[PDB]
Amino acid sequence: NASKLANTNVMVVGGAGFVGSNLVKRLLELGVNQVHVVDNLLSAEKINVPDHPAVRFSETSITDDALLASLQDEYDYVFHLATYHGNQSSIHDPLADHENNTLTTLKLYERLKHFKRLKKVVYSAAGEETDIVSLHNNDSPYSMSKIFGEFYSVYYHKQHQLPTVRARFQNVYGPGEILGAGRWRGTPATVWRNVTPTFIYKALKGMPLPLENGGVATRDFIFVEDVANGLIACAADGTPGGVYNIASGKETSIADLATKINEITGNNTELDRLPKRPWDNSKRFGSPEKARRELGFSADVSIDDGLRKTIEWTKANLAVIEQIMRKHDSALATYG
């Protein structure tokens, strides 16, 4: 963690997004001097970027040449969270993915490489830590772009001493993830972004939660405020050139996720759940041990507590979320 961030100047690329908006909130709580949010709103809503005396917002792509040339060596920390959201959208259009997922990292790093005030540049990568990768089983252009940004992070550190730290995480959930956020990116996943907000929304509407294959799939969910603190710990204390898993270390099946959401929301509809078998998940989830040992970081928000917090926020904001989702009604109808 740290008050190492108190009174500092920070840039959050992708800072209007789900993880980004939460990181910005936490940085302001820690008393940073300035946050420069650079976000084109491609998969985000402007209501997630506060109008705050300490927040500067550039509604602009990080690949923009003018914006890049305008940047000054006035930042202590940079968090690079931009992506092309997400797997499905990237498959639909690999060139839209490349512009907003691969080239973003390269152009940013190229601009930052001779900056001297920078203490750390933290890159959100996809989830002990190894730096060996296979050419196979990269299911999407998104997955490749995330790996490519790790390659860039290592290169700019070795060649130009850019103080990069790669933070690998997965299955983040919590307040601030808005179904339908941003522009239509090609597929229904623009609306139905991820399983948790989908289930919470449908449960709040009293609808049956669709389980694929009885919900035997397991995931290591992590609450977004823990991810924000993990990213801050990487910034403050992560080793330049290094990589850390930011992970809960706890697996929850989709069936149990749905069960919990139904019980918290009062959704009395049926669940077509099946018993998990040894072949259903035969594999790898990230160990949280390195971050615990080196950074003193642990993601301790339980799936029960994180879900209550998320549902509370979703309830309070349901009308706003519904209006955002509805902008895609026509695209949703045309799809396929």
Ligand X SMILES: NC(=O)C1=CN([C@@H]2O[C@H](COP(=O)(O)OP(=O)(O)OC[C@H]3O[C@@H](n4cnc5c(N)ncnc54)[C@H](O)[C@@H]3O)[C@@H](O)[C@H]2O)C=CC1
Instruction: Tell me the C-alpha to C-alpha distance, in Å, between residue 207 and each of 36, 162, 200, 314, 316.
Output: 40, 49, 10, 15, 19
Can you tell me the distance from the alpha carbon of 66 to that of 86, in angstroms, rounded to the nearest whole number? 27
Q: Helix (H, G, I), strand (E, B), or coil: what is residue 13?
A: strand
CA angle 61, 48, 197 (to 5 degrees): 105
Can you tell me the distance from the alpha carbon of 88 to that of 111, in angstroms, rounded to the nearest whole number? 30
Could you say whether residue 198 binds its own copies (CB under 8 A)? no
Nearer to its own copies, 215 or 286 (CB): 286
Can you tell me the distance from the alpha carbon of 54 to that of 127, in angstroms, rounded to the nearest whole number? 32
Nearer to ligand X, 137 or 268 (CB): 137
Residues 310 and 178 sit within 8 Å (Cβ to Cβ) = no
Nearer to its own copies, 117 or 158 (CB): 158
269 closest CA partner among 229, 322, 210: 210
Least separation in angstroms between CB 154 and ligand X: 17
Q: Is 68 annotated as a binding residue?
A: no
Could you say whether residue 133 binds its own copies (CB under 8 A)? yes
Nearer to its own copies, 136 or 283 (CB): 136
* Binding footprint of its own copies, residue count (CB under 8 A): 27
Q: Is 208 annotated as a binding residue?
A: no
Least separation in angstroms between CB 92 and ligand X: 15
Residue type, 303: I
Q: Are strands 252-253 and 218-219 parallel, antiparallel or unpaired?
A: antiparallel
CA dihedral 282, 303, 175, 13 (to 10 degrees): -50
Q: Are strands 120-126 and 218-219 parallel, antiparallel or unpaired?
A: unpaired
Q: Is 62 annotated as a binding residue?
A: yes
Q: Rule CB under 8 A: choose which of 87, 138, 239, 259 binds its own copies.
A: 138
Range 148-177, binding ligand X (CB under 6 A): 169-172
Nearer to its own copies, 155 or 184 (CB): 155
Could you say whether residue 204 binds ligand X (CB under 6 A)? no
DSSP 178-225: -TT-SS--SSGGGTS-SHHHHHHHHHHTTPPPPPGGGG--EE--EEHH
Could you say whether residue 19 binds ligand X (CB under 6 A)? yes
**171 interface partner picked from its own copies, ligand X, none, CB below 5 to 8 A per type:** ligand X
Nearer to its own copies, 150 or 226 (CB): 150
Range 77-106, binding its own copies (CB under 8 A): 91, 94-95, 98, 102-103, 106
And the tokens for 321?
Answer: 């979320």
Beta strands in 180-316 (DSSP E): 218-219, 222-223, 242-245, 252-253
In angstroms, the first-to-last Cα distance of the chain is: 46
Could you say whether residue 274 binds its own copies (CB under 8 A)? no
Residues in contact with its own copies by CB under 8 A are 91, 94-95, 98, 102-103, 106-107, 110, 131-136, 138, 141, 144, 147-148, 150-152, 154-155, 158-159
Binding-site residues for NAD(+), in ranges, read 18-19, 39-40, 42-43, 61-62, 81-83, 100, 124, 142, 146, 171-172, 193
Residues in contact with ligand X by CB under 6 A are 13-14, 16-20, 38-44, 61-63, 81-83, 85, 100, 104, 124, 126-127, 146, 169-172, 182
